[PDB]
């Protein structure tokens, strides 16, 4: 896994994209650079022990959608460190850093049913008091939670489901 | 529905869709060419991977094969059908006879019986072996263990215990062969079948030739059969051919599973790997298991981690030694290291306990003199120490015995010695009333009366 080795490149790319106010461009540049990594053949070449810069060049050749200085330089450094397979996670950490910096967060509503749209209003409003961020809901439905609702935000959840009441009681008995 | 992605020696990594990954100890399957191979999963790594051990020859596996996920652990035939038949680690029949007609199959991974359910019995078991039931008597329902280096007698002794207690015991019996010679298992099978007792014994064999997965998991199959018989309310004899091979097969695989090594190379989980097995072979209120286990000690080092952690799991421990066997004194039991939980006045009665402790005291006093005897010779001893030495050197021989299963080696016919008849002999020698008889009069004889006879003929 690559979470721990993506963190430095993610932080550096984000700092740079902030100093040049080009966050929104970097995000898709990185998405493309990630999906090139997933190609059947490229993934083979990425595992073959090519020397660094020949691998870097074979990689850059496949990208015209990278801004010709900074994206190339990121790719070249990652090649120097043989970490090109970490791009899929450099992307996720870049996105998360963007969220944290723009003070905008996302919270999940899991429910027995769709909600009445003033419930959603109250939910999001009160979430922006649990959390300081601008909150983007994306509700979903399930019936294992036969009733009530679950509010999962980051990794903090508030269990309002009735299922989570039944079982929470049973273990008392 | 899963793909292989690595093959290191005996361990194979398999990749499943994130949502379908198998549970620990589930059994997978692969078609190794014109073959079928069973994998037992050992760990769940992240990302839908799972890491497994191959119950068969790992050779011939490509990366990218397709493996099928059986959704249940290994399960073996169990009950009366199993009886008088030889079985694989997977519970396949391995003699040439037909299918096992079993009604029921049990998973070989199980929990130990609750502390609430154990039972404790003092009822002594007599064995026709002077030293074993003088120094280390053991009880119906207990555990026994034979420790010894290579080639000192821990297999022949187990065959004599089989002969003595197992033919004279009504209930069923289970023999697990773990990582020892196939020749010996064949000799055993044919001796049984040619004395018509095979139909009371069940056999399981994962002998030296098989790959590490078989030698790893075979002892649990043997245990599962014994555990069925126990829970029927019967009482059972369980003989394990060499339990050290189970931990050794664990060590072989440990590194490939990615675990840092420990004290002398052993796996980190040594004591747990051994407890989780030794703890379900016990008697209980519903039935009882009497078990004899041979425990190899490597390089004759009684302090290696593997013997050292096993000593704690046995009731009666018999310790063979090469320095005694090199004197031709079989059985080579060392009486200053053998011991039993049952050697209490409240259990064996005062006279037997007192005789055993007197014999130990003499043999220890004889050890304390061997350095001065070695340096200065026997003449510098006090006149009473010469008598201690002269009696110890007789006690050592009289602990010898000829065995019915050792006629092959020595011609001399075997003997069976009753306990009452041996505590008398040792009480005699200690009290100095046979103190006019040559040493070689006691060597390889039955009761003290065969010695007094052998003296007449030189």
């Amino acid at each position: 896994e690559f979470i721990t080795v993506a963190r430095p490149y993610a932080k550096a790319a984000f700092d740079f994209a902030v100093e040049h106010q080009s966050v929104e461009r970097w995000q898709d540049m990185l998405a493309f650079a990630a999906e090139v990594t997933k190609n059947e053949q490229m993934a083979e070449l990425l595992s073959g022990a090519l020397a660094p810069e020949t691998l870097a060049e074979s990689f850059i050749a496949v990208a015209g959608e990278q801004l010709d200085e900074n994206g190339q330089n990121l790719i070249r450094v990652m090649a120097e460190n043989g970490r090109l397979n970490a791009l899929p996670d450099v992307l996720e950490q870049f996105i998360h850093l963007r969220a944290v910096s723009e003070a905008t967060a996302e919270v999940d509503v899991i429910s027995a049913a769709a909600l009445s749209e003033q419930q959603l209003a109250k939910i999001s409003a009160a979430m922006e008091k649990r959390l300081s961020r601008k909150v983007k809901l994306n509700a979903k439905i399930d019936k294992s939670v036969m009733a009530g609702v679950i509010i999962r935000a980051g990794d903090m959840v508030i269990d309002g489901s009735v299922r989570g009441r039944l079982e929470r009681l049973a273990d008392v008995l | 529905t899963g793909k292989i992605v690595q093959v290191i020696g005996a361990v194979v990594d398999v990749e499943f869709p994130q949502d379908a990954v198998p549970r620990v100890y589930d059994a997978l399957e692969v078609q190794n060419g014109n073959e079928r191979l069973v994998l037992e999963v050992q760990q769940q790594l992240g990302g839908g991977i799972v890491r497994t051990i191959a119950m068969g020859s790992s050779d011939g596996l490509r990366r990218g094969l397709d493996v099928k996920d059986l959704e249940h652990p290994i399960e073996v035939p169990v009950g009366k059908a199993t009886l008088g038949r030889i079985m694989n680690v997977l519970g396949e029949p391995v003699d040439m006879k037909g299918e096992i007609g079993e009604e029921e199959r049990w998973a070989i991974h199980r929990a130990a019986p609750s502390y609430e359910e154990l039972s404790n019995s003092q009822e002594l078991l007599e064995t026709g072996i002077k030293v074993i039931d003088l120094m280390a008597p053991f009880a119906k329902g207990g555990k026994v263990g034979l420790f010894g280096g290579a080639g000192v007698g821990k297999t022949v002794n187990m065959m004599e215990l089989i002969r003595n207690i197992a033919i004279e015991h009504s209930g069923y019996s289970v023999f697990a062969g773990v990582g020892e010679r196939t020749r010996e298992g064949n000799d055993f099978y044919h001796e049984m079948t040619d004395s018509n007792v095979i139909d009371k014994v069940s056999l399981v064999y994962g002998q030296m030739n098989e790959p590490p997965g078989n030698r790893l998991r075979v002892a649990l199959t043997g245990l599962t059969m014994a555990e069925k018989f126990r829970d029927e309310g019967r009482d059972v004899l369980l003989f394990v051919d060499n339990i050290y091979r189970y931990t050794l097969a664990g060590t072989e695989v440990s590194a490939l599973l990615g675990r840092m090594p420990s004290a002398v190379g052993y796996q980190p989980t040594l004591a747990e790997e051994m407890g989780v097995l030794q703890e379900r072979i016990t008697s209980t209120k519903t039935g009882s298991i009497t078990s004899v286990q041979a425990v190899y000690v490597p390089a004759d080092d009684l302090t290696d981690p593997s013997p050292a952690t096993t000593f704690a799991h046995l009731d009666a421990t018999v310790v063979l030694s090469r320095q005694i066997a090199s004197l031709g004194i079989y059985p080579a039991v060392d009486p200053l290291d053998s011991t039993s939980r049952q050697l209490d006045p409240l259990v064996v009665g005062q006279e037997h306990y007192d005789t055993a402790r007197g014999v130990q005291s003499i043999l220890q006093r004889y050890q304390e003199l061997k350095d001065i005897i070695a340096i200065l010779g026997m003449d510098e001893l006090s006149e009473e120490d010469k008598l201690v030495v002269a009696r110890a050197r007789k006690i050592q021989r009289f602990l010898s015995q000829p065995f019915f299963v050792a006629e092959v080696f020595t011609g001399s016919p075997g003997k069976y010695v009753s306990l009452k008849d041996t505590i008398r002999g040792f009480k005699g020698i200690m009290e100095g009333e046979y103190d006019h008889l040559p040493e070689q009069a006691f060597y390889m004889v039955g009761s003290i009366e065969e010695a007094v006879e052998k003296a007449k003929k030189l």
Binding site: V157, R165 | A111, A263
Partner: protein
């Protein structure tokens, strides 16, 4: 009685009634690995070290590694059922164990669940498993005896209330027997006893419990069990669960005695847990902080002065000093005391009882080796009669140990030394003792006085034991009030010395052995 199903159903109704259905926010994570009892949890930004994480089913794990992007946690129970992708909750809780007076006479696993099958506990609330011992300013110097009932120990190696005495020796030399006689002997002394077993096979725990039940002791003691089949986390945490059950008594002015059987198996379980978490190994592959593992366990054995009790019990108990006594046990391979765990615990504790396998074979039982056993508390913990009488046994055995080399040339020796070289053997033959036969202080004092004042100078070696038995029988009927006085006060006077000389004089002439 039980036909009162109304009790059952109304009690279920009480559990229903008090179920406060309000919701609480909790922190969550997901399992991403399962192996050999360790799980890796990805998430739980707010886990704390030592926290109890709660898995599906009523199971828990102790979070031990807060790595940058994972949490390594050890499952406390059968782990084979867990699976990648399961969800896990971080309670705020630390591990707590039932405790109190009702546990006496119960068997419990390391989570305080009853394992003997005599129905639920009746505890006095809960206590944290991991606590910090009383400080320097809260102790009180140990000056009371805890009697083992072994001539060999209570004379030459006293144990005081609040001391920590290490029993160490090779396999099968009486390490367990000595501790369990120490426990049996408290069946009437006011000291509560705790026997915590690490990594033993269950059919042995059951056996020692059956023996504590034969004698009267079981009703006085708690048993904590972590059988060899239980996961490493339970075997490793059991001693803390026992200490936390002894501290309930210590912190309330009572006395307790706790017996960690095989700290040398707690150390092994902790090594396994460390190597599976990939922590850098030290010597013999033991992790670095295996000193700090035992140090902060044993330093909970303490005597606390009355003011700390009054502060803790909020004024309810006054003028009494609590005390927790520990007797850890260690096992040494081939008598070797220079290994990692022996050499640590020898450094932590206040004394050592070295049990020798040679002495155990030669017939000397208990096999305590007097020449290398020590007790830094020493005479300060004895009754002053014993303190008086045992000083001469020390010197008798020391001179015997200096002379012993000549025993193999003895016939050549000079009677001026032959006297000493035989008195040594007679006092050594005197300290042999049978199992499950503890002696009151009166009997040990009498029997040591007999040998100190030369009465045995003429009894023949092989008869010393029958001499001792006859003497102990005689005195029990024909001089009982003196035994009552000594046992009740332990004092010593020229008056008492005269009475003892009289008893010996009458015995040595008017009876026989």
């Amino acid at each position: 009685m039980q036909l009162n199903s109304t009790e059952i159903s109304e009690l279920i109704k009480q559990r229903i009634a008090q179920f406060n259905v309000v919701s609480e926010a909790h922190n969550e994570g997901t399992i991403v690995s399962v192996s050999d009892g360790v799980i890796r949890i990805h998430g739980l930004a707010d886990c704390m070290q030592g926290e109890m994480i709660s898995l599906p089913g009523n199971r828990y794990a102790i979070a031990l590694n807060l790595e940058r992007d994972s949490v390594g946690a050890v499952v406390m129970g059968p782990y084979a059922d867990l699976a990648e992708g399961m969800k896990v909750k971080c309670t705020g809780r630390i591990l707590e164990v039932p405790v109190g007076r009702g546990l006496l006479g119960r068997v419990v696993n390391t989570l305080g669940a009853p394992i003997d099958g005599k129905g639920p506990l009746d505890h006095d609330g809960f206590s944290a498993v991991e606590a910090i011992a009383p400080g320097v300013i809260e102790r009180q110097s140990v000056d009371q005896p805890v009697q083992t009932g072994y001539k060999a120990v209570d004379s030459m190696i006293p144990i005081g209330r609040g001391q920590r005495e290490l029993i160490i020796g090779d396999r099968q030399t009486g390490k367990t027997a000595l501790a369990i006689d120490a426990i049996i002997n408290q069946r009437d002394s006011g000291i509560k006893c705790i026997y915590v077993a690490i990594g033993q096979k269950a059919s042995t725990i059951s056996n020692v419990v059956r023996k504590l039940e034969e004698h009267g002791a079981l009703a006085n003691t708690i048993v904590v069990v972590a059988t060899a089949s239980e996961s490493a986390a339970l075997q490793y945490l059991a001693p803390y669960a026992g200490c936390a059950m002894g501290e309930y008594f210590r912190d309330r002015g009572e006395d307790a005695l706790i017996i960690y059987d095989d700290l040398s198996k707690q150390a092994v379980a902790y090594r396994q847990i460390s190597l599976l978490l990939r922590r850098p190994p030290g010597r013999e592959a033991f992790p670095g902080d295996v000193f700090y593992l035992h140090s902060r366990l044993l330093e909970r054995a303490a005597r606390v002065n009355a003011e700390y009790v009054e502060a803790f019990t909020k004024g309810e108990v006054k003028g009494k000093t609590g005390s927790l006594t520990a007797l850890p046990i260690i096992e040494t391979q081939a008598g070797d005391v220079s290994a990692f765990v022996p050499t640590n615990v020898i450094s932590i504790t206040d004394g050592q009882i070295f049990l020798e396998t040679n002495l155990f074979n030669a017939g000397i039982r208990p096999a305590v080796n007097p020449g290398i056993s020590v007790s830094r508390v020493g005479g300060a913990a004895q009754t002053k009669i014993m303190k008086k009488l045992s000083g001469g046994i020390r010197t008798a055995l020391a001179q015997y140990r200096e002379l012993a080399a000549f025993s193999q040339f003895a016939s050549d020796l000079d009677d001026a030394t032959r006297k000493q070289l035989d008195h040594g053997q007679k006092v050594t033959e005197l300290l042999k003792q049978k199992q499950y036969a503890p002696m009151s202080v009166a009997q040990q004092s009498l029997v040591l006085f007999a040998a100190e004042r030369g009465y045995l100078a003429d009894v023949e070696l092989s008869k010393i034991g029958s001499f001792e038995a006859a003497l102990l029988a005689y005195v029990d009927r024909d001089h009982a009030p003196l035994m009552q006085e000594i046992n009740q006060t332990g004092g010593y006077n020229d008056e008492i010395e005269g009475k003892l000389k009289g008893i010996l004089d009458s015995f040595k002439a008017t009876q026989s052995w």
